[PDB]
Ligand binder design. Structure first.
Ligand SMILES: *[C@@H]1O[C@H](CO)[C@@H](O[C@@H]2O[C@H](CO)[C@@H](O)[C@H](O)[C@H]2NC(C)=O)[C@H](O)[C@H]1NC(C)=O
Ligand SMILES: *[C@@H]1O[C@H](CO)[C@@H](O[C@@H]2O[C@H](CO)[C@@H](O)[C@H](O)[C@H]2NC(C)=O)[C@H](O)[C@H]1NC(C)=O
Ligand SMILES: *[C@@H]1O[C@H](CO)[C@@H](O[C@@H]2O[C@H](CO)[C@@H](O)[C@H](O)[C@H]2NC(C)=O)[C@H](O)[C@H]1NC(C)=O
Ligand SMILES: *[C@@H]1O[C@H](CO)[C@@H](O)[C@H](O)[C@H]1NC(C)=O
Ligand SMILES: OC[C@H]1CNC[C@@H](O)[C@H]1O
Ligand SMILES: [Ca+2]
Ligand code: NI
Ligand code: NI
Length: 641
């Protein structure tokens, strides 16, 4: 079949860019403590122009101290009157992105909120001005402390919006001189935001972009009618195998074709979280071993390149895009400066399945496509060619330049299945490369941290992935034997996105660990009612954190201890009395081998040969009984898998 590409009677919609999400939750957690040069190479693969993924857009979670899928992320306001714009790693990531690409688009979106915003209720719309104050302070802080211009602000990730809040947010933004900041809504479904915009004139004026999640390449009529920009503000979320790459390739094309969506943002940016956490390895690439330095430049990186390296925000789709007769699709974009980019995909059904949604079988076969260039695209003589084959795979390999010497302005390709072609008048394409990273090693079977860092670059010790609550470096200037510790700093349950545990917890190590000995110095700050624990064989985290089983060694300031099989403390292995009070350092040791475990207090056996379920595996962990202050020091673990 012949497919005409032409700009004679106008253009399509303005292309807004391809991006990815860091956050929801703690997806970039393990990236920060990568040794150089590896950490910097990974960021180059993601954000350096004309190199790797070359992303146009970076979206980050505005941490609200709650569990938001693979962990918690710290807020800039743990408490009322608290301001701190140097917690976590999203500030750092955004700055790294801007250094490589100054034109990158920055977006922020809340998943959860600090509990104090709710004023007693678990609800961010009790005081609209207060919640707006919180969010806008985050944007101001981004500019004032990090020289970051946030381009787009969201509402509440995959949660109900309040129309009056969106309006108050706009007023708050303009009042602080942030008119340039745009609002995207509602980062959930097409409805009810689409119909709300049609029914409410004032709401229409304050919303700039309608952003839907996992729309299956389609939109809805009311969204078209609004005349707003339509984005797939969160998509993908599939394991970065060849299959996930196929999913990414197909939806990148068909989101605009089928659904008029001029931007697609993948969750997540990079899989830098323990793979056994929910949705493991669902990033554009993988970097889940800072201890070894090993990272995988997965195929979605090069799938992205086919569009990102040859398109920029401000470009325009041609009116002439669509599906191929024998399956697959093609899009075409111009910059208005005589350049032209053509992106063609022929992903088979079996090799492009996304998790959300899963498409009914469709068929793709061998085919010939003849592209004819009419209008101002006529005097194009030469097209650079880029090719990718997923499956016995090869990625982003430049092919021999294509020539249109005969004035027909036409060419012809044979398109097999699971293939990508990018045809462009751009000469800047490059498959970036670095020397291959170290091989993958397990988490060190012998690990220790004394948290003795006087000027930490980040707010938390490495490899500790908070799954409920928030743990930070802490300096106590008056105590010398525990001058530098790790502290759980939440004192009330957040306005939650997920089902956070009722106890705080941070996991670390190797999920495949079976036999282990965990030791840590603990400090209970709350008299009478306070409590802490250490644990091994913790099998679940993330949005499943309340599900976590394992062996949990608790001690309480009322002079007692418990040994449970679950974080929720419903199943008892052992319990009894102990010489434990608040505001006093203790050394807890927990040993687990096979069917039996023992617990030590200051090097003395508290319980021994206590029967636990076996087989069983999981991480090591520390935590507190509730959302309460407590300190930890001299963490050690020895384990075997
Ligand atoms: C949104 O995109 C759709 C295509 O998915 C446009 O609907 C028509 O699509 C057919 C092909 O199925 C084209 O031949 C028509 O030209 C399209 N309509 C028009 C008016 O051109 C639809 O127009 C788009 N809606 C927008 C841009 O608001
Ligand atoms: C295609 O795009 C390139 C890159 O933007 C254009 O080249 C730029 O042209 C502007 C003037 O319009 C110059 O200021 C830049 O220095 C150029 N950059 C580069 C890298 O060449 C180019 O004009 C466009 N058209 C064609 C036919 O290449
Ligand atoms: C964890 O400890 C258990 C308990 O000792 C180990 O299981 C034993 O392993 C030895 C050596 O292979 C066998 O001779 C025993 O018959 C096993 N007993 C049971 C009850 O399984 C287990 O191998 C250890 N696992 C690791 C990874 O070190
Ligand atoms: C898919 O399409 C080709 C040609 O159109 C046809 O030969 C083939 O049998 C089809 N296969 C299935 C499983 O539908
Ligand atoms: O598919 C999983 C994703 C859905 N949307 C929010 C993300 O945090 C993540 O949970
Ligand atoms: Ca210390
Ligand atoms: Ni300021
Ligand atoms: Ni497991």
């Amino acid at each position: 079949g012949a497919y005409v590409l032409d700009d004679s009677d106008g253009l399509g919609r303005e292309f807004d860019g391809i991006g990815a999400v860091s956050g929801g939750g703690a997806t970039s957690r393990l990236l920060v403590n990568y040794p150089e040069p590896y950490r910097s190479e990974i960021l180059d693969y993601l954000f350096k122009p004309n190199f790797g993924a070359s992303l146009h857009i970076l979206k980050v979670e505005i941490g609200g101290d709650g569990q938001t899928t693979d962990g918690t992320e710290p807020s800039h306001m743990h408490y009322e009157l608290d301001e701190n714009y140097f917690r976590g790693y999203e500030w750092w990531l955004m700055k790294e992105a801007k250094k490589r690409n100054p034109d990158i688009i920055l977006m922020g979106l809340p998943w959860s909120f600090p509990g104090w915003l709710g004023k007693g209720f678990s609800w961010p719309y009790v005081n609209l001005q207060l919640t707006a104050y919180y969010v806008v302070r985050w944007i101001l802080g981004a500019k004032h402390y990090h020289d970051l211009d946030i381009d787009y602000i969201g509402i509440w990730n995959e949660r109900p919006f309040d129309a009056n809040y969106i309006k108050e947010l706009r007023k708050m933004l303009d009042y602080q001189g942030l008119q340039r900041v745009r609002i995207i809504a509602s980062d959930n479904l097409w409805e009810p935001i689409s119909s709300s915009l049609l029914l409410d004139q004032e709401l229409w004026k304050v919303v700039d972009v309608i952003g839907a999640h996992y729309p299956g390449t389609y939109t809805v009529w009311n969204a078209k009618m609004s005349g707003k920009k339509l984005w797939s503000s969160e998509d993908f979320s599939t394991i970065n195998s060849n299959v996930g790459a196929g999913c990414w390739s197909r939806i990148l094309n068909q989101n605009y074709i089928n659904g008029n969506m001029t931007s697609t943002i993948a969750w997540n940016l990079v899989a830098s979280y323990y793979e056994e956490l929910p949705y493991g390895r669902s990033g554009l690439m993988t970097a889940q071993e800072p201890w070894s330095g090993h990272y995988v430049v997965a195929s979605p990186i090069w799938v992205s390149a086919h569009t990102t390296q040859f398109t920029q925000p401000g470009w325009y789709y041609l009116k002439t895009v669509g599906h191929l007769e024998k399956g697959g699709s093609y899009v075409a974009l111009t910059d208005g400066l005589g350049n032209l980019t053509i992106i063609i995909e022929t992903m088979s059904h079996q090799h492009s399945m996304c998790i959300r949604p899963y498409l009914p079988y469709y068929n793709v076969s061998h085919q010939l496509a003849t592209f004819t260039l009419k209008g101002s695209l006529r005097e194009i003589q030469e097209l650079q060619v880029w090719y990718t084959k997923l499956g016995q795979r090869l990625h982003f390999k430049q092919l021999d330049t294509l020539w249109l010497l005969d004035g027909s302005g036409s060419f012809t390709l044979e398109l097999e299945e699971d293939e990508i072609f990018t045809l462009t008048t751009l000469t800047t394409g490059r498959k970036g490369s670095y020397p291959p990273p170290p091989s993958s090693k397990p988490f060190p079977t012998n690990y220790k941290d004394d948290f003795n860092v006087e000027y930490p670059l980040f707010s938390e010790a490495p490899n500790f992935a908070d799954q409920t609550g928030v743990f930070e470096y802490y300096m106590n200037n008056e105590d010398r034997e525990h001058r530098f510790t790790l502290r759980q700093v939440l004192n009330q349950r957040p306005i939650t996105w997920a089902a956070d545990a009722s106890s705080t917890i941070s996991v670390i190590g190797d999920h495949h660990w079976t036999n282990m000995t965990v030791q840590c110095d603990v400090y209970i700050e709350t008299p009478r009612s306070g409590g802490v624990f250490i644990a091994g064989r913790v099998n679940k985290g993330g949005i499943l954190i309340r599900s976590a089983t394992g062996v949990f060694f608790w001690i309480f300031a009322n002079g007692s201890y418990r040994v449970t099989a679950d974080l929720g403390g419903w199943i008892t292995y052992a319990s009894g009395h102990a010489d434990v009070t608040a505001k006093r350092w203790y050394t807890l040791t927990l040993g687990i081998k096979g069917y039996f475990a023992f617990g030590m207090l200051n090097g003395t056996i508290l319980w021994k040969n206590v029967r636990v379920k076996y087989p069983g595996h999981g991480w090591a962990a520390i935590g507190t009984h509730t959302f309460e202050f407590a300190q930890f020091d001299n963490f050690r673990v020895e384990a075997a898998r």
